[PDB]
Amino acid sequence: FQVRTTGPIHNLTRQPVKIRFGEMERDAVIGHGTSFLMQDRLMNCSDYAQSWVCRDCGSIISIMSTISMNGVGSASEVRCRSCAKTSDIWQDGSGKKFVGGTNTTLIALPSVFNYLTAELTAMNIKMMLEVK
Amino acid sequence: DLSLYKQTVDLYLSIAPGHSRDPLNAIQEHMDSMILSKLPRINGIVLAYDNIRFLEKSAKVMYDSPFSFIWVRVDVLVFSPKKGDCLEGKINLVSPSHIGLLILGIFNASIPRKSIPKDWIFIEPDTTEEQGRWKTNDGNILEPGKDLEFVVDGQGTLAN
Amino acid sequence: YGEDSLDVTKQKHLTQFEFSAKNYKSLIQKYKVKSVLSAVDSETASSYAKKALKKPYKYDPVLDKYPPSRYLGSVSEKFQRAVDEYTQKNPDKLIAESKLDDSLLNESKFKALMQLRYQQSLVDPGESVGVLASQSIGEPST
Amino acid sequence: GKAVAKEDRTTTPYMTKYERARILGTRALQISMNAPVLVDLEGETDPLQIAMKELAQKKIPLLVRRYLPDGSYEDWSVAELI
Amino acid sequence: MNIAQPVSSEIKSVKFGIYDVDDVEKISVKQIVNPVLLDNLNHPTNGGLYDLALGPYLKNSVCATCHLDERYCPGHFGHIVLPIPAYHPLFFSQMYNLLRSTCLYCHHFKLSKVKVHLFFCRLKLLDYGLLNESEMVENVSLAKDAATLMRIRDEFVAKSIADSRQLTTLLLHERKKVVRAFYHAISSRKQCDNCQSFSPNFRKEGFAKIFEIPLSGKNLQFKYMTSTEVRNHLRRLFVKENVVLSRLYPASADMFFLQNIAVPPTRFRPASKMGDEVHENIQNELLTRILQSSIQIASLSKDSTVEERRSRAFELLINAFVQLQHDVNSLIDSNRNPPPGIKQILEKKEGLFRKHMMGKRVNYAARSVISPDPNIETNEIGVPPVFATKLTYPEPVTLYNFNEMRNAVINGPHKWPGASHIQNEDGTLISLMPLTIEQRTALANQLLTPQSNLISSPYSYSRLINTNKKVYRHVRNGDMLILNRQPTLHKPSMMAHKARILPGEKTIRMHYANCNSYNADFDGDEMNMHFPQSTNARSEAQFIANTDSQYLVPTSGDPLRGLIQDHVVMGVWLTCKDTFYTRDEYQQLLFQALKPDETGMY
Amino acid sequence: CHFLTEAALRGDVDDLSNPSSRLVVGRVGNFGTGSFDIFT
Amino acid sequence: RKSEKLDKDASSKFLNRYIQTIEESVLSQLNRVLMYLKG
Ligand SMILES: [Zn+2]
Ligand SMILES: [Zn+2]
Ligand SMILES: [Zn+2]
């Protein structure tokens, strides 16, 4: 007997810490023809994230939030590093200036995929996921 | 110069679910927020928009949410001061650290003494310590001549 | 898909011709004839079906020429063979001769009901069926 | 891509067992987010069974796009389906 | 998940590929040069493996790069430099084979250029989906004459694509076979066909060491060292043979080796504080170890540039080289260097893609022992009021369910049918546990009213006025909550029952009919009980996958639900013809059977 | 790792076909109720 | 995402049209810029 409404999350993948739903539960749900129930119970309720993605360069890690643009003012308008080279320009935490890397949008992908991007880039092999 | 512009842009507007009877209301509802607010794609401040028409594609519903989405063609009127050429503004604040102007009554111009050559000298009046006339090398006073013309860096420049 | 009609769920009672013809008054209201006969084609595939039942070749199965979702005459060959062998063999329920028929039944009425049955009980398109076969092989193995 | 014309539509006129569930689900979500109800309520509270009452009378918006395997798609009004 | 989140992106495709030397430089924000991790002040060393611009450590340390706390900063990668570059541990086999087929004197492949051009025409024509056309190129039978043959083949392919123009499994099933044949072919030739000479072979090791003896004397008529020379050799091969390697993979410089590898932020690299012992992790341990070897190489190459002197110098240089190569190899692959590596935290069969991606632990899912009950329904599942209070789902508040939700928040999160807590339109969560009923009533009255203190509070994207206030409410007698049983073999094993909330017991109750479906015995096996949160999920569970619609197994038509032992024996005894009832028993037994009011509609 | 290095060398692109690939990137499946897109 | 060519007189006439179409601070500043550009 153990009922889990909400609780701690995982260090790396932001999963519920160690009930098990998958690899056979997925068979059942995509058997019933329940796309939305699968995408709910697996992606929504386990680990949900809104991660920024560079639309042009098509990658998810080389993005960075802009720093010290002005006073309180407006929103920190995120930009990209790998796609980069007064309004448009921006600095870094250490003070390095950049320009370019404007096409950045919101996508929704599970935190485990972000962890996979991490452990994958540590191997230098990286996926460039496109967005429309 | 001809620093005012109008550009017919196409945006991806999220029609809230509460306005699924008519889209126009939910379009205006977030268009009237963008006015006088920086639309960074075009790198300027939106001033005007009309001819609100949607490319009819039966606006699409997000795959788990009730608010729809659609591409809409609307024409903005951004003011672009991208160091094009000479502009002009009315002075409001003056100091021996920078000069303060308002162009179009709206947009600020902070011209530091760096971009000003030394030849112009500031007199410090006895009534106000900070506020005073920034006299030119010729000797002319600028407070009666509120209209000051210059060229832009991005910020202004009085050095030639 | 597998000679379409459906995986077992909606195909059990096709072989039960005695049962469908027994009452037949509830099945027409279950299929909602007045709404189905409107927008689907009825004459074309039904006409070509008989010509496909001509034993010589050069007339393909009705399912191949005419899709079964909208052409309400198109149905698998063995289904036609079986419904006709029942209608001719043991029609003790189906009345006839034909003059005494026009009170409550008609051979043509029943064959229309059965055509409508096959039509309304196709596989629901979009079904993921790979895992249906996967699980129908995993379950009885264990 | 192509948007197949209204004259020639090859998909099934039946509201498939899936389009019914998702139409009712999205209509329930819409009505739950303070959308207009197109049919008189009799006191039902759940923001879903209202959508069942709408669908029983075929008074519902939200045409569906059926994506054929070519890449093309049909546009079916929920009034138009059987 | 929230329903107000407006995400407009639609992830349309992923594409893999190597990340060159210039991109790992552009994406990186800081460099890690210092093998020291923590100083006496216990704060992270600057530029260190735990840099605050790398990833914000705990204890309210704001990221130096993004100036936002751990709640909002997605981590920023880093890079560590090495002018050694060692070859990649994965393509090491494929790199070594492509080297084996190299011609060092020829600077081409050992193959005949006409065969390489044949395979190039093949991989060109398979591009646009031409299978039999891919195989027809070979119906030609015939260096200058070989050059003419190459022109015949290329013009055949050009005309074929011209006729065709005006991915699928079969295309890929043919590409993979043709490339396997190509790689069987190029590894066969020992003598050059263009150079006619015999390039010096190379012999490998499992410990990542490669080289072999020089040319032989008869062929002259016609061991381990630095990886830099083989790197430049492969770069030369790649730049001189462009089209075939372009189709096969224009650029192939930094695929096989690595010049500056990246570090993940602290967010993915924690230190599990298991009681008192503090080991950072094997990952940061291995990164620190390669960092030590890197600085050792730096010092040693300095010593060598400033200088049997060359003998010992080169010996020690190559030994430090091989330590660095073997260390990177031990990092990315744990099957070498007799410490879990990246490939071994993936391929572990206990790691990713089976325990973290396909099957994830889930929120809002109870689990308990079942016990049988005949009184409820064939649909319904009894849940004690404990599961009533402990499973909640969000609900926007409208005009006609406002009474239900106000009353729910009044009852509170300790009394069924109370509600759990409120979610504002902007997105915060106002709890309801510590509040007192005066505060709860004051809050529940002002629950349906525009409370955002602006037309668009945070910024100028104005849907924050259209959203509703979401009360998390408890389950109630109509909510549809999935049941399951592991192992769940076939689809009738995971169904969705309506919940009916019983008082008293501490064991959920379901009817006997489902006992045949779940393959359960009510003897101690327990069942996961989920709750579909969003309304789309509960709608589809109610209409598509609800229990009463699972009357037919998928294998054969034969139905699986239906009554069991007691009901059927009493059936033989009730329908039997020697039975008789007076009026009282008839009416009473009938009404016990029907029980309309609990079901309704009549 | 084997299928991974193979897909990394060649750099092969899926649209997003099967429910498993659709699941790893977090979108809904193409089967079932996720087959069509529903518009206003 | 599109851009086109434009002259100043089109911009001013459209400023007029936008003063006309949707009817506090915003239109105040727009009258300010209208009074500054003309004259
Ligand atoms: Zn990048
Ligand atoms: Zn940061
Ligand atoms: Zn050679």
Author numbering:
A (entry chain B): 1029 to 1046, 1054 to 1120, 1128 to 1174
B (entry chain G): 3 to 156, 167 to 172
C (entry chain A): 1063 to 1158, 1162 to 1207
D (entry chain F): 61 to 142
E (entry chain A): 1 to 142, 172 to 195, 203 to 258, 321 to 347, 354 to 411, 421 to 451, 461 to 724
F (entry chain A): 1642 to 1681
G (entry chain D): 12 to 34, 44 to 59
Article, verbatim:
Transcription of the ribosomal RNA (rRNA) precursor by RNA polymerase (Pol) I is a prerequisite for the biosynthesis of ribosomes in all known eukaryotes. Here, we use single particle cryo-EM to solve the structure of Pol I from Schizosaccharomyces pombe (Sp) in a monomeric (apo) and an actively elongating form at high resolution, showing that Pol I cleft contraction upon transcription activation is common to both organisms. The architecture of Sc and Sp Pol I is similar, despite poor overall sequence identity.
To determine the structure of a monomer, we stabilized Pol I by crosslinking with BS3, followed by quenching and size exclusion chromatography. Consequently, the ‘bridge’ helix of subunit A190 is mostly disordered in monomers (poor density despite higher overall resolution) and forms a well-structured helix in ECs. We do, however, observe a density that we attribute to the ‘expander’ (‘DNA-mimicking’) element in Pol I monomers. This density is located between the ‘protrusion’ domain of subunit A135 and the ‘clamp core’ region in subunit A190 on the upstream region of the active center cleft and appears to prevent unspecific DNA binding. Due to flexible connections to the ‘jaw’ domain of subunit A190, we refrained from modeling the exact residues of the section in the Sp monomer. Location of presumed expander density in the cleft is comparable to that observed in Sc Pol I dimers, while the element is flexible in Sc Pol I monomers. In contrast to Sc, density for the expander element was observed in Sp Pol I monomers, hinting at an additional possibility to prevent unspecific DNA-binding to Pol I monomers.
